[PDB]
Amino acid sequence: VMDVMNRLILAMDLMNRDDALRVTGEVREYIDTVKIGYPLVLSEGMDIIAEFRKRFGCRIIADFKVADIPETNEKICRATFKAGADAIIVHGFPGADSVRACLNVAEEMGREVFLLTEMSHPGAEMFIQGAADEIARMGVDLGVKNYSGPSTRPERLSRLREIIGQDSFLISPGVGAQGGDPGETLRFADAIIVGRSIYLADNPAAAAAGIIESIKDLL
Amino acid sequence: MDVMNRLILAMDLMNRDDALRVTGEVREYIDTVKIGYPLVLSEGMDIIAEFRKRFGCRIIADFKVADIPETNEKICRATFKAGADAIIVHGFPGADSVRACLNVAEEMGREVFLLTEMSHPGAEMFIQGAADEIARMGVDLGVKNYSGPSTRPERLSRLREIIGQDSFLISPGVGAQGGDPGETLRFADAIIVGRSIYLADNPAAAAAGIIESIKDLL
Ligand SMILES: O=c1cnn([C@@H]2O[C@H](COP(=O)(O)O)[C@@H](O)[C@H]2O)c(=O)[nH]1
Numbered sequence: 511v512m513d514v515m516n517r518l519i520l521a522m523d524l525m526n527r528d529d530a531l532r533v534t535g536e537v538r539e540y541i542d543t544v545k546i547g548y549p550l551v552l553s554e555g556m557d558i559i560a561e562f563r564k565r566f567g568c569r570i571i572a573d574f575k576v577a578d579i580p581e582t583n584e585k586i587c588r589a590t591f592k593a594g595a596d597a598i599i600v601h602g603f604p605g606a607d608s609v610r611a612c613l614n615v616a617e618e619m620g621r622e623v624f625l626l627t628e629m630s631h632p633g634a635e636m637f638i639q640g641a642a643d644e645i646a647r648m649g650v651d652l653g654v655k656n657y658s659g660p661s662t663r664p665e666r667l668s669r670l671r672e673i674i675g676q677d678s679f680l681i682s683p684g685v686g687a688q689g690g691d692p693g694e695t696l697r698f699a700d701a702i703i704v705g706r707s708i709y710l711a712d713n714p715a716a717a718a719a720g721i722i723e724s725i726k727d728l729l
Numbered sequence: 730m731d732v733m734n735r736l737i738l739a740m741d742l743m744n745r746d747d748a749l750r751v752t753g754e755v756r757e758y759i760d761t762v763k764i765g766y767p768l769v770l771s772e773g774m775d776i777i778a779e780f781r782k783r784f785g786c787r788i789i790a791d792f793k794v795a796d797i798p799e800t801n802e803k804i805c806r807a808t809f810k811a812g813a814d815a816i817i818v819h820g821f822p823g824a825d826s827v828r829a830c831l832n833v834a835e836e837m838g839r840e841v842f843l844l845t846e847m848s849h850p851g852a853e854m855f856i857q858g859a860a861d862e863i864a865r866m867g868v869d870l871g872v873k874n875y876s877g878p879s880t881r882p883e884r885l886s887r888l889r890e891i892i893g894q895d896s897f898l899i900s901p902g903v904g905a906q907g908g909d910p911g912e913t914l915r916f917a918d919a920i921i922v923g924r925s926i927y928l929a930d931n932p933a934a935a936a937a938g939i940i941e942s943i944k945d946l947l
């Protein structure tokens with residue numbers, strides 16, 4: 511599995527290149543893995559991935575919530591890996607063919623897929639939560655090794671960990687701003703994802719350091 | 730929304746030169762282009778303004794928006810800043826995520842299309858069973874624009890029933906995925922067509938052919 515420094519992944523959702531680079535640089539001693547999503551990519555271009563690789567020694571997870579038909583999913587994954595992403599996040603709710611399409615491209619291109627199981631926001635209760643255990647089981651059947659699940663619902667995160675097994679790699683957003691606790695989340699997830707609690711802080715480095723101090727016995 | 734010839738081009742070529750040339754070739758037949766991540770991730774968001782400069786066409790950003798509300802808001806803002814007239818949003822992530830998109834669209838003078846059921850085989854696993862409820866959620870939220878599956882006209886008809894005749898309904902899966910242009914237009918206001926046009930030996934003839942087949946439907 512990827513070796514995530516300090517079990518902490520930065521969700522870099524600032525939408526300005528200068529701010530995104532400044533904040534990421536400030537926390538670089540604490541974090542070697544950065545999740546870049548569409549807020550930044552749609553604002554600054556896929557070349558922002560290149561820029562991060564150039565500036566920082568960071569692994570890049572493209573949080574693109576891939577959620578199209580197989581043919582389109584293939585194209586999205588190809589473009590994303592071509593740009594230098596180490597991994598891509600993919601929805602399971604569009605079904606097994608859509609997921610398989612991403613897995614096939616990742617296998618061919620030597621990169622990784624993370625399957626999102628249940629989302630951490632309130633609206634997730636409406637449809638995704640009821641499908642999440644089956645989505646996780648589907649991932650296991652398809653050979654998915656990497657997953658994302660919700661910090662905001664420890665009971666759900668625990669069940670999802672059970673389904674995917676201890677050997678699977680599990681990351682978890684919703685820590686901090688959305689209400690999730692770093693330590694409790696790391697009972698089940700391999701790494702936590704943190705965005706606003708760090709990138710909106712007056713001192714992002716102090717914020718990251720504070721989170722890390724709070725989980726030091728788990729490192 | 731008034732779509733020329735009831736035909737929306739899905740421009741999923743991944744090269745700027747090819748995408749611009751093929752769109753140019755069929756410009757006399759369309760005034761609405763759906764641009765998705767295949768093109769945007771290959772050539773940048775600046776491609777949207779370039780399409781407007783060259784063709785004056787309407788632009789629907791097919792970004793399958795599917796994040797938490799806070800992130801959805803950012804995605805919609807970035808997308809509308811790039812000049813998109815509308816954006817396609819998943820309903821599966823729930824009502825708050827959809828509402829986030831509706832907010833930005835209202836703010837910037839744009840439209841949200843709610844995707845209810847997808848057209849590929851895997852849609853049967855989870856989406857299809859949620860689709861009627863997603864459509865009702867759209868109605869509850871005041872959504873006026875929807876997308877549904879050409880490949881399942883019985884499902885498309887049901888979608889139409891739920892949202893009513895006043896709502897605007899577009900439908901992908903025509904051609905390559907097996908859907909029929911004329912049958913789909915029994916229920917949808919407009920059909921989306923990608924590969925059957927952009928991978929054709931002669932895209933202009935392909936477009937003309939499709940239009941000829943639905944001429945009695947305008
Ligand atoms: O279920 C979820 C919830 N959030 N996110 C993403 O993780 C980050 C959470 O950031 P935050 O710490 O500012 O809440 C954002 O990029 C959000 O899109 C997910 O991928 N899945």
Ligand SMILES: O=c1cnn([C@@H]2O[C@H](COP(=O)(O)O)[C@@H](O)[C@H]2O)c(=O)[nH]1
Binds near residue numbers: 921924
């Ligand atoms: O349920 C679906 C199926 N396809 N599409 C999109 O519509 C287009 C269909 O293209 P095609 O005519 O080449 O199949 C592609 O951009 C695809 O991502 C959707 O938005 N929803």
